[model samples]
Target: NITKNTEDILASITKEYATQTQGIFGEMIALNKSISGTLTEMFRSTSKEDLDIDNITNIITNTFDNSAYSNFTYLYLIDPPEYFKEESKFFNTQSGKFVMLYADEEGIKAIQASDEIANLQVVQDILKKAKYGENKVYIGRPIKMNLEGQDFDAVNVAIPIFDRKNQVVGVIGMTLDFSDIATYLLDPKGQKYDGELRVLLNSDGFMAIHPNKNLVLKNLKDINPNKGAQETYKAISEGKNGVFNYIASDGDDSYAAINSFKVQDSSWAVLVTAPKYSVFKPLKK
Candidate 1:
């Protein structure tokens, strides 16, 4: 009975997160559409030579300005053929990609945005794919880096730019602030149901985002640092996913919400758990 009453709400939470994730997958569709016209017109009218380093930068930034991204974000244009030289391919052991410009909140560090983009693997991957199809946007895992000398967790979103020739001329990639997403999406209150414990996991079942800030990025098997906890982690990783009844190493019977969903485009599934007794406290007697 405990499992019966609460399973529905648990599904609700999981579905909500899934919906949020898919929406994120589509967030850049507007940007791709919004800029193609401007680029097409400008490329047609101008010699494409006057669009210099700063000139291209302004071009990218202006596209961002015209949009309502409304996130503390950075968007840059990438020219793959010109940017991804063979020598710099492996480790980006050089300066990096040719960044046109980035647009974002004024207070944050610009260094955290454009000049450093040349070294990231995401840019090359997105630009290459964007050339084939400007329809996709790739979202990366949360990474901790120094922004404005303050450590922050940001996720990267890559959008490809296509030219009149249907070739990928550049990529417009954006870095999204996870702090804002968490405050609104990952918090317990953000969970929208009482007694909910929602966890965001990477494919390896590592906690990418959790209500307990300290647990962010931790592997679930590391719990109690017990070598025996691998069973739970193994189940989590292997199960195709739905609510599962499982026993914890600590000997409590718990109901696990293992529904699978996309974070960007794959199984960065959200896990919502609770003591079976509580989630279904309203027992259908």
Candidate 2:
């Protein structure tokens, strides 16, 4: 089904099927679904849906957890009833690492301290903004994170959970591999293509990933102040998603495909770009 270039990218980049919804937002919502179900069933089955204060306050807990929805790990719930936050496993301001409840290979367990940490204010704030929607997820800026004792390039896939009144009660958070996104852009399921250049951007228009590091951290708008180029960046900033062409800084025409979803919970936008001719030039086999 994914035979053509644009179609292939669009198909995989859609919010349709389950497997298709695999980016930060979809993946976060998917995990939220799973985690919500586990907790929902826990309450529904035991009639604890309405509880006194909460289970965490009493150090009482449930094994409600799951992992591996994607490059995500430490799939966890937080502040619903409040973290088992008191436990050293959740956080210690002095130690400077915040722990999270998680599902383990063996079952549910606290993914504890591992000489590592990540900055999470952006995602935490996004979760605070959570309400009701298809899945209501946030993606943070791509970053390096410590997972199970190792620091890896990762992004936060986060979603907010709500109470009956639709007020958020807690959040579901996980780490996704930053590189997996690159592979996603490269993979066409079954299509055959070669060297189709891909560029990644943050919601702020800054380059997040590129073939060259020099381009990284530079926003395309600042690099190419052309009216059309600036308009394209504005369109993305305004949450408009599509494909467009513009004049490059070097005076060559360029092509870009923008997707306005969260990557690392910034919830703004990001895109893939290639030189116009290189992406659609006449060629011989």
Candidate 3:
């Protein structure tokens, strides 16, 4: 039997955080849609010729600088093959953008030519399944560097770009400077809340983006993907939206509130976790 005091505290904190989390979650959803819409419109008005190095650079710089994504450090656009050859299609057409914020040319280039970007098994599979299917978006988890002299975790987000006739033409990709999001989560104000937050992609049991750098590249399969996780994944897969609460293993007792939705025709989920006490502390009095 739960104490009345504990019950009341839980109820109040759940209500408060639910409201706050919903606001942030909604903003992210709206932002993604706005970005997607803007990209679609831009594509409609521009052509391959218009996407020359200088013009492409300007488009990315303007998009990142003028929008909430100003925090991103690098952006790239990859052109799909004209004739659909296997290897050349995978290699030749990626563009680059950097803001002089860092001095890591080799690192940047490696990421641009990564198998995840070049081969893109998932995207290939999807395309094979359906020609000109709806555009898909996906985020990759950070991975440790194994190449000589290369070190640091890295992650990226990819959005499919289509032609005027709605055919897959290229992909617009961005490499996130983890520090941007990490610093925000570790801010004094954010720390006071005592809640854990994570960003997931496509419900594929992978941690694409997370406040904890260590967990950023880890597979969700390492831990039990609970019923709540599955349900949330299902909804997003179907192009719907959902939110729910559940228990998670955070080395301590914690409750998680997850909001999942489709962003740019692909699935994305945000999980917010808080210790029961931290959540209910305000109501102790």
Model 1 TM-score relative to the real fold: 0.67
> Can you tell me which runs of candidate 1 are displaced by over 4 Å?
32-47, 52-116, 127-135, 162-169, 188-196, 204-206, 221-241, 246-253, 277-285
User: Candidate 3's residue-wise lDDT over 246-271, tens digit each?
Assistant: 44535434454445554344444555
lDDT of 2 by residue, 151-172 (tens): 5555565555455555554445
Candidate 3's C-alpha runs over 4 A off are: 1-57, 65-116, 120-155, 159-167, 193-202, 209-212, 224-250, 276-285
Which candidate number maximizes lDDT? 1
Q: What TM-score number comes out for model 2?
A: 0.57
- Model 1's alpha-carbon lDDT is 0.54
**Worst 10 contiguous positions by lDDT, candidate 3:** 94-103
Give candidate 2's error at residue 184 in angstroms. Answer: 2.5
Looking at model 1, report the run of 10 residues with the lowest lDDT sum.
Answer: 84-93
lDDT of each: 0.54, 0.50, 0.44
Evaluated at residue 203, the lDDT of candidate 3 is 50
How well does each candidate superpose onto the true structure, as a TM-score? 0.67, 0.57, 0.50
Q: What lDDT does candidate 3 reach at residue 247?
A: 47
Ranking by lDDT: 1, 2, 3
